[PDB]
């Protein structure tokens, strides 16, 4: 008997233990865009020395330009006008924010804000049904209340910020309409692979979507979540391309690289590690799923055929 | 028809506008002792030069050995215990802890922290009977939450600080018993001079106490209010003390000097100016009060009195 097969080894930690504290600033709203923001038509750039990937290596770029696909950290409602309009210009079909947040946030006063816990880990362990209706009774609760809404300085803890008598609270969902975009949620947890529930989630998503439907996945920081769908966004619709090329493409555009590489982690940061090796496991075992449950359609769903067919770390 | 008399200026604030954010850390626990400690027995020292004081002037001592009072900044239930048992050196009488604070406060597993609004003024406006019963509340509400306690740093907002589930919710009530003191607070709010049912509080508690009875108080900081009511009480007990020796003598023992000075301040805080003009104009005030109704043993009380001869700016 295995407790916890590899990828969900986040299952075991335990959420009162990392209970949102404070209402953290998500975008200081100073740029025109989020951070990271990246498109699947972009050019490909050098690899970062971190990864010690071979810079000599030219990618193919097989499918990237029908791909239709784009990144990026949080965002204001401004920002998020600009990624629409500038989406825009590259599609007629319908343009998607893809939500990866598990963690509660929303928009107090116009202000991107999240419910904060150690680890950004405040709805850990909560159903989907679970955590969205956390966000709605949080956001709803504070309206016409004061409010310290700050940012994360020395060592995860707030920094400075500011408190504020609310008087306008928004979801994402509307922030998203606004801007002429439709919303999709998948409640994913900071720092760690995607669940079952949320892969399963996402691929009944997929393949629904109109031919021209073009996706912008979005986390906090654009980093880790929004990377990890991009990847298997790309490997779902190009499946004739290699391993290798799908990962060393979306970090080339500007994401992080999902293989193998020398994991090095501050001392305070040690917790990563193993979640890190997890999601170099789990981009794998994905590839194994797309390549071996294309031919009949996907009949089989990735949590039962994960069941199944369990990753080894 | 004057909307605010003088010595109720801070009645014209709007309390919405200061509502708390934030479970302020009240002290490190890293001394012995409480900030600002001090006692009646103490030795004068030199003036501090920001109040322009005649350094050469020898204030007359009359009753200070007899008064029995001290004063400090908020504490940790430890140094709270140091401080009784260093009382207890000095007397054989009723050692009370005299809280003068409106704003609420106590105690999670042991940290002294108070719900902390801007200016310190969460409590504004809110008679003692509410003060009391926002704070029992908040503090039974802590209890095996998760919650977020923090120094203020710059600009007066959080800074670093932890986050931990309590396990121990009490009230300065219970740390002060435990310590071996009686209790007794008034809640005056921070900065201001205290009111007229803060003052006639203390003078009807002042008129109960056995000769023998020692007075400690204490406010956040250890200063404002904490000053003011040793004034008051040194006043009281030594009515025949000059103003101007009772006001040297409790600043140079380590208080506020609560005589006229140029007033100084940064201009982030100009706000504080005309408080601290009326602070030194009640004062006055007070002292008046006590002169003129000691001898008939206090028939009338300092608020109707105060109403029949209103303080002038
Ligand atoms: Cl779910």
Redesign the interface.
Known sequence: TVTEPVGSYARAERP??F????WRLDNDGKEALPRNFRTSADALRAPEKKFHLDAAYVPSREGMDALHISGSSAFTPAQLKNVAAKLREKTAGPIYDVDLRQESHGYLDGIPVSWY??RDWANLGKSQHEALADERHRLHAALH????I?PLG??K???????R?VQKVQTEQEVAEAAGMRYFRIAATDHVWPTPENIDRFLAFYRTLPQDAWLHFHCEAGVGRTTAFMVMTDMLKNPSVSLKDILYRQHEIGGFYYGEFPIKTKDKDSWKTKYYREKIVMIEQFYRYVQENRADGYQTPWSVWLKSHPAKA
């Open positions: 009162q233990d209970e949102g504290f404070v816990g150690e209340k004061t409010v310290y700050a020395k060592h803890l707030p920094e400075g910020g500011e408190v008598r």
